[PDB]
């Protein structure tokens, strides 16, 4: 302990460094395939951000797979935007991509992203 | 992107989930040995927090090791406190452990921890 001190910037610094490892392809251990596109990532980061990836990588057989193929209805740009969000906290939400981002976030089980997509859509109707 | 929105709590939520994976021993890929004690962890988290572990796991031979043995002068409690800090942002700094925490943080190349240890020591002299 109750006597701990805390470094405010630590969590963001860790995330920034995990994104630098991803950029340089250091210790990436899985390829996510979204139709014709491939995305290299760290399984622990995916599990920490997505209920779907947590379910996949806690499965006794799927935990050992080096390639995961997503449903063909998933938009690669939508997945790219959510993968960037996982590694940076920043979501590039635009009129031209919001429906694909929302559909991808529902599939990946990322409720906070689903919620902001619903709010932006509702504001425009 | 320049049009991104940001989820303030994302980085801390990611770190909290990586610590939950560590607690449950999920996808841990290295054992750090500090004399008689063993600590299971994720190489990417260690690399994101420590200059020493970044150097170790970017080495073309050491990146593949599943066990890393630290210098015998390193105190296991000191290492435990810094490993908890890496996964939570919280540092359990006490009169009885500050010298060991500072020595361990210098070895692990964690400058922000070294800096607060120096400030607490200086305040007591």
């Amino acid at each position: 302990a109750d006597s701990c001190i805390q470094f405010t910037r630590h969590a963001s610094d860790v995330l920034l460094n995990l994104n630098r490892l991803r950029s340089r392809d250091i210790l990436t251990d899985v390829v996510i395939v979204v139709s014709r596109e491939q995305f290299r990532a760290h399984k622990t980061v995916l599990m920490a951000c997505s209920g779907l990836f947590y379910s996949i990588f806690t499965d006794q057989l799927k935990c050992n797979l080096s390639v995961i193929n997503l449903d063909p209805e998933i938009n690669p740009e939508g997945f790219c935007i959510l993968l960037d969000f996982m590694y940076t906290s920043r979501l590039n939400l635009r009129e031209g991509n919001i429906m694909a981002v929302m559909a991808t976030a529902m599939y990946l089980q990322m409720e906070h992203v689903v919620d902001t997509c619903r709010k932006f859509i509702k504001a425009s109707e | 992107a320049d049009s991104c929105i940001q989820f303030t709590r994302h980085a801390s939520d990611v770190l909290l989930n990586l610590n939950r994976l560590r607690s449950r021993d999920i996808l841990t890929d290295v054992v750090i040995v500090v004399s008689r004690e063993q600590f299971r962890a994720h190489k990417t988290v260690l690399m994101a927090c420590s200059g020493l572990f970044y150097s170790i796991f970017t080495d073309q031979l050491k990146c593949n090791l599943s066990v890393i043995n630290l210098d015998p002068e390193i105190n296991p409690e000191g290492f435990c406190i810094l490993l908890d800090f890496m996964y939570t942002s919280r540092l359990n700094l006490r009169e009885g452990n500050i010298m060991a925490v500072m020595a361990t943080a210098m070895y692990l190349q964690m400058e922000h921890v070294v800096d607060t240890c120096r400030k607490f020591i200086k305040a007591s002299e």
């Binding site: 701990c4 001190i5 805390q6 470094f7 405010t8 910037r9 | 919280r90 540092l91 922000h112 607060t116």
Partner: peptide
Amino acid sequence: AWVIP
């Protein structure tokens, strides 16, 4: 940074 959490 450091704070009392």
